[PDB]
Specification:
Layout lengths: L7 H7 L14 E8 L6 E7 L5 H12 L6 E8 L5 H13 L3 E7 L8 H12 L3 E4 L2 H10 L14 H16 L1
Parallel strand pairs: 3-4, 4-5
Antiparallel strand pairs: 1-2, 1-3
Helix pairs in contact: 3-4
The protein binds zinc ion.
């Protein structure tokens, strides 16, 4: 179901942190995962998810059906193009509350297009369930380029406005969470 990496043009298009930019009708989810008991990690998995159900649900389906074992722990990290929608966000926090051997860190390139108060709550329900929510910065984009993109060993070229858009996004995110 999931992919290993994505085409460089899909990365630069869906992961540009232009807070308000339509054309991104899909939601992409880069993930990395560490499976571990009570010592060091005994395995790991990374990959990419696209919308085809949202990309969030395509993860939880694949994850539960193929990976989740009751006597093992999971350190999951998400890099999403759009921040998770209210419906998926609630279904993740419900998963998080029932599965304590899973910890999630969500980094998003963007929040939402409109100021939906609905969406700010799902982002809060997530945080209340122990999940870590943050806005992707230069280092996160750089990390996704090197790990989830067929980059052909080309450097990550940051776009104009990266830091400025992240700054406006991290501001709005912090107000949501507190
Ligand atoms: Zn969603």
């Amino acid at each position: 179901n999931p992919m290993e990496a994505m085409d460089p043009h899909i990365f630069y298009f869906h992961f540009k942190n232009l807070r308000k930019a339509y054309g991104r009708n899909e939601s992409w989810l880069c993930f990395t995962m560490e499976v571990v008991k009570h010592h060091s990690p005994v395995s790991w998995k990374r990959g990419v998810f696209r919308n085809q159900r949202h990309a969030e649900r395509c993860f939880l389906s694949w994850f539960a059906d193929d990976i989740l074992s009751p006597n093992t722990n999971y350190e999951v990290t998400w890099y999403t193009s759009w921040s998770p929608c209210p419906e998926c966000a609630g279904e993740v926090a419900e998963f998080l509350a029932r599965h304590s051997n899973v910890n999630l860190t969500i980094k998003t390139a963007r929040l939402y297009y409109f100021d939906d108060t609905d969406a700010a709550e799902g982002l809060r329900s997530l945080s209340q369930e122990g999940a870590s929510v943050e806005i992707m910065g230069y280092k996160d984009f750089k990390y996704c380029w090197e790990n989830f993109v067929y980059n052909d060993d080309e450097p990550f070229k940051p776009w104009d406005g990266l830091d400025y858009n992240f700054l406006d996004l991290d501001s709005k995110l912090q107000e949501i969470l507190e």
